[PDB]
Symmetry: C2
Protein backbone atom coordinates (compact mmCIF):
# COMPACT_ATOMS: atom_id res chain seq x y z
CA UNK A 1 0.00 0.00 0.00
CA UNK A 2 2.75 2.59 0.66
CA UNK A 3 3.39 2.31 -3.10
CA UNK A 4 0.00 3.78 -4.16
CA UNK A 5 1.26 7.38 -3.91
CA UNK A 6 -0.98 10.19 -5.07
CA UNK A 7 -0.35 13.88 -5.67
CA UNK A 8 -2.55 16.79 -4.66
CA UNK A 9 -1.80 20.43 -5.45
CA UNK A 10 -1.64 22.25 -2.04
CA UNK A 11 -0.53 25.45 -0.33
CA UNK A 12 2.32 25.48 2.20
CA UNK A 13 2.94 28.08 4.94
CA UNK A 14 6.00 29.29 6.80
CA UNK A 15 6.83 31.95 9.37
CA UNK A 16 5.81 35.55 8.74
CA UNK A 17 2.84 34.54 6.64
CA UNK A 18 4.94 33.36 3.66
CA UNK A 19 3.22 30.79 1.43
CA UNK A 20 3.97 28.42 -1.46
CA UNK A 21 2.14 26.42 -4.09
CA UNK A 22 3.21 22.88 -4.41
CA UNK A 23 2.18 19.25 -4.35
CA UNK A 24 1.48 17.02 -1.38
CA UNK A 25 2.48 13.43 -1.93
CA UNK A 26 0.11 11.20 -0.01
CA UNK A 27 -1.27 7.69 0.36
CA UNK A 28 -4.72 6.36 1.23
CA UNK A 29 -3.65 3.83 3.83
CA UNK A 30 -7.04 2.29 4.50
CA UNK A 31 -9.57 5.05 3.77
CA UNK A 32 -7.75 8.05 5.26
CA UNK A 33 -5.43 10.38 3.27
CA UNK A 34 -2.01 10.31 4.94
CA UNK A 35 0.30 13.09 3.73
CA UNK A 36 3.94 11.95 3.38
CA UNK A 37 5.68 14.92 1.89
CA UNK A 38 5.35 18.33 0.35
CA UNK A 39 7.25 19.51 -2.77
CA UNK A 40 7.62 23.16 -3.77
CA UNK A 41 9.95 25.69 -5.42
CA UNK A 42 10.23 27.65 -2.20
CA UNK A 43 12.43 27.33 0.93
CA UNK A 44 11.22 28.18 4.47
CA UNK A 45 8.00 26.18 4.59
CA UNK A 46 6.91 24.86 8.00
CA UNK A 47 3.46 23.35 7.61
CA UNK A 48 0.58 22.40 5.42
CA UNK A 49 -3.10 22.51 6.44
CA UNK A 50 -4.17 19.01 5.37
CA UNK A 51 -7.87 18.26 4.86
CA UNK A 52 -9.74 15.22 6.19
CA UNK A 53 -13.57 15.17 6.46
CA UNK A 54 -13.20 14.92 10.23
CA UNK A 55 -11.40 18.20 9.84
CA UNK A 56 -8.18 19.92 8.98
CA UNK A 57 -4.88 18.88 10.51
CA UNK A 58 -1.78 21.08 10.42
CA UNK A 59 0.94 18.84 9.32
CA UNK A 60 4.40 19.96 10.38
CA UNK A 61 7.31 19.72 7.93
CA UNK A 62 10.93 18.72 8.43
CA UNK A 63 13.69 20.95 7.06
CA UNK A 64 13.68 20.44 3.29
CA UNK A 65 16.04 18.53 1.12
CA UNK A 66 16.88 20.08 -2.23
CA UNK A 67 16.51 17.88 -5.32
CA UNK A 68 16.76 18.11 -9.05
CA UNK A 69 14.11 17.84 -11.65
CA UNK A 70 14.43 17.89 -15.46
CA UNK A 71 12.82 20.87 -17.34
CA UNK A 72 12.71 22.20 -20.98
CA UNK A 73 15.66 24.47 -20.15
CA UNK A 74 17.59 22.06 -17.99
CA UNK A 75 17.78 21.02 -14.36
CA UNK A 76 15.96 22.98 -11.67
CA UNK A 77 16.00 22.64 -7.92
CA UNK A 78 12.91 21.94 -5.86
CA UNK A 79 12.50 21.42 -2.15
CA UNK A 80 11.19 18.17 -0.67
CA UNK A 81 9.75 18.43 2.82
CA UNK A 82 9.02 15.23 4.64
CA UNK A 83 6.30 15.31 7.24
CA UNK A 84 7.69 15.14 10.80
CA UNK A 85 8.16 11.65 12.17
CA UNK A 86 7.62 9.87 8.80
CA UNK A 87 9.12 6.35 8.99
CA UNK A 88 11.82 5.01 6.67
CA UNK A 89 9.40 2.88 4.64
CA UNK A 90 7.24 5.87 3.81
CA UNK A 91 10.23 8.14 3.16
CA UNK A 92 11.55 5.54 0.72
CA UNK A 93 8.16 5.42 -1.05
CA UNK A 94 8.36 9.20 -1.55
CA UNK A 95 11.93 8.97 -2.97
CA UNK A 96 11.05 6.07 -5.27
CA UNK A 97 7.94 7.84 -6.56
CA UNK A 98 9.95 10.99 -7.16
CA UNK A 99 12.86 9.12 -8.81
CA UNK A 100 10.48 7.40 -11.20
CA UNK A 101 8.47 10.50 -12.07
CA UNK A 102 10.82 13.57 -12.26
Amino acid sequence: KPGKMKVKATKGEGDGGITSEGNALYNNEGGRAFMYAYVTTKPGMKYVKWEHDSGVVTVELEPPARFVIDTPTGPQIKYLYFVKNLNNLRRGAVLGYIGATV
Copy 2:
Protein backbone atom coordinates in the same frame (compact mmCIF):
# COMPACT_ATOMS: atom_id res chain seq x y z
CA UNK B 1 18.79 12.82 -1.54
CA UNK B 2 16.86 10.80 -4.12
CA UNK B 3 19.91 8.55 -4.86
CA UNK B 4 18.81 5.49 -2.80
CA UNK B 5 15.34 5.74 -4.38
CA UNK B 6 16.71 5.91 -7.96
CA UNK B 7 15.88 2.68 -9.78
CA UNK B 8 16.40 0.76 -12.97
CA UNK B 9 14.86 -2.42 -14.28
CA UNK B 10 16.52 -5.43 -15.80
CA UNK B 11 14.88 -8.53 -17.21
CA UNK B 12 16.09 -11.55 -15.25
CA UNK B 13 15.34 -15.10 -14.09
CA UNK B 14 14.31 -16.55 -10.73
CA UNK B 15 14.37 -19.99 -9.11
CA UNK B 16 12.74 -21.69 -6.13
CA UNK B 17 13.81 -24.83 -4.30
CA UNK B 18 11.96 -27.61 -6.09
CA UNK B 19 12.80 -26.76 -9.71
CA UNK B 20 10.50 -23.73 -9.77
CA UNK B 21 11.62 -21.13 -12.40
CA UNK B 22 10.38 -17.65 -13.46
CA UNK B 23 11.10 -14.68 -15.68
CA UNK B 24 10.65 -11.22 -14.30
CA UNK B 25 12.21 -7.91 -13.57
CA UNK B 26 14.98 -7.10 -11.15
CA UNK B 27 14.73 -3.58 -9.72
CA UNK B 28 18.20 -2.32 -8.92
CA UNK B 29 20.16 0.80 -8.28
CA UNK B 30 23.53 1.46 -9.79
CA UNK B 31 23.73 4.78 -7.97
CA UNK B 32 27.53 5.07 -8.09
CA UNK B 33 30.06 2.24 -7.95
CA UNK B 34 28.10 -1.01 -8.41
CA UNK B 35 24.72 -2.56 -9.30
CA UNK B 36 22.71 -3.29 -6.20
CA UNK B 37 19.53 -5.35 -6.77
CA UNK B 38 16.69 -4.37 -4.43
CA UNK B 39 13.80 -6.60 -5.57
CA UNK B 40 12.39 -9.00 -8.12
CA UNK B 41 8.93 -8.93 -9.60
CA UNK B 42 7.39 -11.87 -11.33
CA UNK B 43 4.04 -13.68 -11.94
CA UNK B 44 4.87 -16.82 -9.86
CA UNK B 45 5.08 -17.65 -6.10
CA UNK B 46 7.77 -19.79 -4.46
CA UNK B 47 10.88 -18.02 -5.83
CA UNK B 48 13.85 -18.05 -3.48
CA UNK B 49 16.74 -16.82 -5.63
CA UNK B 50 17.45 -14.67 -8.65
CA UNK B 51 20.29 -15.27 -11.09
CA UNK B 52 21.94 -11.79 -11.23
CA UNK B 53 24.60 -11.19 -13.79
CA UNK B 54 27.62 -9.19 -12.62
CA UNK B 55 30.80 -9.14 -13.81
CA UNK B 56 31.06 -11.08 -16.61
CA UNK B 57 29.43 -13.37 -14.00
CA UNK B 58 26.25 -14.85 -12.46
CA UNK B 59 25.48 -14.08 -8.79
CA UNK B 60 22.73 -15.97 -6.90
CA UNK B 61 20.67 -13.34 -4.96
CA UNK B 62 18.46 -14.54 -2.09
CA UNK B 63 14.85 -13.32 -1.75
CA UNK B 64 12.40 -12.69 1.09
CA UNK B 65 8.91 -14.33 0.86
CA UNK B 66 6.84 -12.39 -1.69
CA UNK B 67 4.02 -9.84 -1.30
CA UNK B 68 1.21 -10.22 -3.88
CA UNK B 69 -0.03 -7.13 -5.73
CA UNK B 70 -2.19 -6.66 -8.80
CA UNK B 71 -1.76 -4.73 -11.99
CA UNK B 72 -4.10 -3.82 -14.82
CA UNK B 73 -3.29 -5.45 -18.17
CA UNK B 74 -5.06 -5.49 -21.56
CA UNK B 75 -6.82 -8.76 -20.57
CA UNK B 76 -7.71 -7.64 -17.08
CA UNK B 77 -6.11 -7.72 -13.62
CA UNK B 78 -2.92 -9.79 -13.15
CA UNK B 79 -1.45 -10.94 -9.84
CA UNK B 80 2.26 -10.10 -9.44
CA UNK B 81 4.69 -11.20 -6.71
CA UNK B 82 7.14 -8.72 -5.26
CA UNK B 83 10.23 -10.30 -3.65
CA UNK B 84 12.61 -8.08 -1.74
CA UNK B 85 16.22 -9.18 -1.61
CA UNK B 86 17.12 -10.63 1.74
CA UNK B 87 17.44 -8.04 4.48
CA UNK B 88 16.77 -5.04 2.27
CA UNK B 89 16.41 -2.05 4.57
CA UNK B 90 13.11 -0.21 5.00
CA UNK B 91 14.20 2.92 3.10
CA UNK B 92 15.02 0.78 0.05
CA UNK B 93 11.91 -1.39 0.33
CA UNK B 94 9.93 1.88 0.37
CA UNK B 95 11.80 3.08 -2.68
CA UNK B 96 10.83 -0.11 -4.52
CA UNK B 97 7.13 0.39 -3.57
CA UNK B 98 7.20 4.08 -4.65
CA UNK B 99 8.81 3.19 -7.99
CA UNK B 100 6.30 0.46 -8.68
CA UNK B 101 3.41 2.76 -7.70
CA UNK B 102 4.71 5.48 -10.06
CA UNK B 103 5.23 3.23 -13.06
CA UNK B 104 2.69 0.37 -12.84
CA UNK B 105 -1.11 0.65 -13.12
CA UNK B 106 -1.95 -0.84 -9.69
